[PDB]
Every structure is written in structure tokens, then in C-alpha cells.
């Protein structure tokens, strides 16, 4: 009814914890003095395992957790300069989805017509 849906119950409806698709941790890494624990986990490698988590090193702002959709909206922006930390790391691993190096990236022939993938010259001689 909003865009184009004939008959599909009504809405997607949350399955469990309404996991998110994207989320970025825009930090400056300059708070190493104040929040030496924050980046600490970042240096650990735990967030690196989270595909749904970016972990950007913004120009020079304050550490803030961001949960986006895809375009860049930003569903939840919370300052982690003291708020809770630590558990925050879990915030992502939990609210995010461990696709496991998946991500909808290039795979097979995409929408194309004609030539879009060369490969030597098969002479073929049965």
C-alpha cells in the first residue's frame, strides 16, 4: 500500500531483535587519552569480524555508534564517550548480522546485454 504490494500479509514484521543491516562507528581515535578502552577493543579485532560494522576514523569527531540502513540515513546515533562502552561492542555484534564475509557483492552475470566478460579464445575441436 506504500509502494507496490498486492498481497503479502501486511509488512515484513520483525523476526526477533529486529537486527540492522548497516552501522558505522565514526571515531577520531584521538580520545585514546580519555577513552583508551574504546579504541582498545577496536585494536583487539573483535569489530573487524563484524561485516555489518564499518569502524571509520572520521576527520576528527567524538566516538559515536551509528546504525544505518544503506543510503546513509542513520537509525541510531548514540555517543559512547561514557554512556556504557564495552557492552557497546556487543551492541553491534548483537544488533548487527554476522553475514560471515557474505554481503551481496559481485557474483554472476549481472544485468547486461551483449559482452561483459571475456576469457581467452576457445578454438574448440571435438
UniProtKB/TrEMBL annotation:
Name the source's superkingdom.
Eukaryota
GO terms, biological process: 'de novo' post-translational protein folding; cell redox homeostasis
The keyword Signal appears for this protein:
yes
Task: Spell out the disulfide connections.
Answer: 28-30
Any GO molecular function: oxidoreductase activity
Q: Does the keyword ATP-binding apply?
A: no
**GO CC term, one of those recorded:** endomembrane system
Q: Where in the cell is it found?
A: Endoplasmic reticulum lumen
Keyword set for this entry? Answer: Endoplasmic reticulum, Oxidoreductase, Selenocysteine, Signal
Every Selenoprotein F/M domain range: 22-96
Q: Where is the composition biased (Acidic residues)?
A: 110-119
- Sequence segments annotated as region (Disordered): 107-126
Similarity comment: family membership: Belongs to the selenoprotein M/F family.
Q: What is this protein called?
A: Selenoprotein F
Q: Which organism is it from?
A: Drosophila melanogaster
Chain's gene name: Sep15
Q: Which residues of the full protein are shown?
A: 62 to 178 of 178
